[PDB]
Design a protein around this ligand. Structure first.
Ligand SMILES: [Mg+2]
Ligand SMILES: [Mg+2]
Ligand SMILES: [Mg+2]
Ligand SMILES: [Mg+2]
Lengths: 436, 436
């Protein structure tokens, strides 16, 4: 039985306040922390901020925290909910909020309680969190699937200077035999990339962005990709490391066109690309580079552009701001045939049950599911267990630098170690990891 | 009873492998992770690395891990040691190594067991870790003393691409009344410093170094210090924030002199400073800027320079590479009156007992003690509890960016919250927090 629900303000990887929740039962105290993205999708569940310009640059979470302590806590504890029944737990929270986008209590107030309950349930059942998550999601009993980690080793767009418009350049060691090996491989590539970057761009560029990847002033995507290839080759892993991209195109969508030079206040408008033109650009990058996944290639509501490209893409197309981990928007994407992979972010919807639901609807439509962190992370490692429990075979949780990233990757090492022979590495089959 | 001792490789904040140890007793599984510095002091205890160029850039810790699982674990488990007797635990580990600098098993193999045991003991005693550490060191808890955080928000030295010779530029919110206020103030100043840095130096300057601080290409310390001051003023915390420094002078100590331009290959040898000359420079920096602490202003073995400076230096003088948390080195520093504060790094010595002894010897000599992280950290939060347990009043665990840093800071927020009226914020009495 839950005897107490408590929330407090803590700091995320960017040094901005966020909500941390603790749920107390006879098994102990279970903690969960909420992540925070930047320039979030317009359709994401509401992240509640104080707005007090004299406190935390106006990014305080006192209101959210109060909502947990003075609203959810007393009601939740009095309801005597069975934490093992995740659906009951989240129906109560959703019903207490009463709004569609959780704007009353705030998604960052609800999620904490939702996630902490699942940890309390796992302990009650005396099983590893990923096992309980698998039960909650009706995943295969075995074999468990270790995911291929897509490491954002090079940042562009809003996460760096230069003209480079694309936001994320990831490497995925699909050629590894185990997660431990993929992670080793990934770190080696990353160190080779950092040394090359400092040598060609200087110490300044050698420094890392919010997710731990290098952020040199790159001019073009081809320049970035060639650097990634050189790093892979230098590391000795050519043929075993693939590339993933997060274009975050909504960032440069203007007048039905895409400005690949949106960082230049004097960008040539005659050079802005239309949907079909931006699609051809991706094709040229795909033909020259080992790209196996492309996230948000088009705007969050530019459905026709997504559908056109999907006709000939030929590789995993991941929807992030387009779907915002929302089953209602996922249905639309499926009907319009806009993509075939969901970037799953629990804080984009607000509850674990809804997130699991988004994943099931995706798999049911033949889609892949890439579990993801947010640009603003914490020492919390929930998504590590979540990606194993959902057996997706793929996760995006940062570069192999900065511990809000390594915390998850290290957790995956412990899970793999613990699973022993009761597990397989997604490898080349990451897209359909759940079918493994 | 300790039924099992196990070690595995995990990744630190820089993407390099390190040792993680788990000790199992009737109370559960207790985990500790070993930190890792860069350009470590010549006298530091041995951090054993594999040196296999075909794996982890030659930075693997398989040898250390094997020492734990193959040598320490069996003997330790059979010895049936009482984890609450930290002295006993550490005497056994040290005896098993039998070397002065832990060159046989490695400090990175021994430290994880030493730390894990103290966590297991705390659980056996049913008290929080900082409480057990207060008992182990015989520290006062009526009331506990919360530390003032020294946040390395501006990077220099070998950690920068300019001429800035000094390695670390920290801010210390000594004017706060609680740790919580101190951390918000620190983060606010940090965010102001970041934007100011990007506008004046460029986006690339906004990128963070290993410890989360900005790394702009600055030429002189004055330039860096003026920027920090503008950040403090812009944040609106004038007079409430002081500055700290980590010169890490050993880095630019060549031919008996100090080269403040050791980053330029054509550095003018006729301009290299001498012991007394470097002091004159610090003295002037102290007169114009709100500097309250200077670390490693002189070479790790250039005692004369240290002694001469301490003579007129009217602020706290921290010893890091000079003492390497070694009771023997500290004794020398005491007798020669080289400094008046110890930077306490558990992995520089190898065991908790020896670190506790170093702190005690320091306090007994009227010295201050600043608990510190290493440039290479992990999601481990031990130092947060240790600084509270040692009642030092001051800690250096990074800038308010990157979770291997926030993990400790957030844990201090939790400890403050849990203690309530049982704790007080050291503030301006940070130097003698133990006597508070
Ligand atoms: Mg986004
Ligand atoms: Mg995205
Ligand atoms: Mg050092
Ligand atoms: Mg130092």
């Amino acid at each position: 039985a839950v005897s107490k629900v408590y929330a407090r303000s803590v700091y995320d990887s960017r040094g901005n306040p966020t909500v941390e929740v603790e749920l107390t039962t006879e098994k102990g105290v279970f903690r969960s922390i909420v992540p925070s993205g930047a320039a979030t999708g317009v359709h994401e569940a509401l992240e509640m901020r104080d707005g007090d310009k004299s406190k935390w640059m106006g990014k305080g979470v006192l209101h959210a925290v109060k909502n947990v302590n003075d609203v959810i806590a007393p009601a939740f504890v009095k309801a005597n909910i069975d934490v093992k029944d995740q659906k009951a737990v989240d129906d109560f929270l959703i019903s207490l909020d009463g709004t569609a986008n959780k704007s009353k209590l705030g998604a960052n107030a609800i999620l904490g309680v939702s996630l902490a309950a699942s940890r309390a349930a796992a302990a009650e059942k005396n099983v590893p969190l990923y096992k309980h998550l698998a039960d909650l999601s009706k995943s295969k009993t075995s074999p468990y699937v270790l995911p291929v980690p897509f490491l954002n080793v090079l940042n562009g767009g809003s996460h760096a200077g230069g003209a480079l418009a694309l936001q994320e350049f990831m490497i995925a060691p699909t050629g590894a035999k185990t997660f431990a090996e993929a992670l080793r491989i990934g770190s080696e590539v990353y160190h080779n990339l950092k040394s090359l970057t400092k040598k060609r761009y200087g110490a300044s560029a050698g420094n890392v962005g919010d997710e731990g990847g290098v952020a040199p002033n790159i001019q073009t995507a081809e320049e970035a990709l060639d650097l990634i290839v050189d790093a892979i080759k230098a590391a000795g892993h050519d043929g075993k490391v693939k590339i993933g991209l997060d274009c975050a195109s909504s960032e440069f969508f203007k007048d039905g066109k895409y400005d690949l030079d949106f960082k230049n206040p004097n960008s040539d408008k005659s050079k802005w690309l239309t949907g079909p033109q931006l699609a051809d650009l991706y094709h040229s990058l795909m033909k020259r580079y080992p790209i196996v996944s492309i996230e948000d290639p088009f705007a969050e509501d530019d459905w026709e552009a997504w559908s056109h490209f999907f006709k000939t893409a030929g590789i995993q197309i991941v929807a992030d701001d387009l779907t915002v981990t929302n089953p209602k928007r996922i249905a639309t994407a499926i009907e319009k045939k806009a993509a075939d992979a969901l970037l799953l972010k629990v804080n984009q919807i607000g509850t674990l049950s809804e997130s699991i639901k988004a994943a099931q609807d995706s798999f049911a439509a033949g889609w892949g599911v890439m579990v993801s962190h947010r640009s603003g992370e914490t020492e919390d490692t929930f998504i590590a267990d979540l990606v194993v429990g959902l057996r997706t075979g793929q996760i995006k949780t940062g570069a192999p630098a900065r511990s809000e990233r390594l915390a998850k990757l290290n957790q995956l090492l412990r899970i793999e170690e613990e699973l022993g022979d009761n597990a397989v590495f997604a490898g080349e089959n990451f897209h359909h990891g759940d079918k493994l």
